[PDB]
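Table S5 (text form). Sequence records supplied for joint modeling of the two-component complex.
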Amino acid sequence: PKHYGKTIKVYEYVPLLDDRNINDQGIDASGATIVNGNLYGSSKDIGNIT
Amino acid sequence: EWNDLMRIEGKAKPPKVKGRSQVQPKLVRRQAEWRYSALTEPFLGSNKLFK
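The corresponding structure-token record, covering 101 residues in total, follows.
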């Protein structure tokens, strides 16, 4: 529609377990504050997942 | 343009300001809203349509 200028914007939602998902909400099993909110990113390492 | 006046879109829309309202009451829609139901009913008053 008119009078909105000349721009259109859309929103894209990334999954839960992607490396692009970066947030400040994370608590690890102990209860402390952890850096990353993803359980694990786009990492398939068996050692890293466990 | 006439449809945009009816639905409040395009040029009929009020400008957007941060500290002020954008409420536009709908006049053309109202005037048409009585006319519709006034006109439709005669064609649905009986079971048969054509004489």
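Note: The longest helix of chain B spans residues 28-40.
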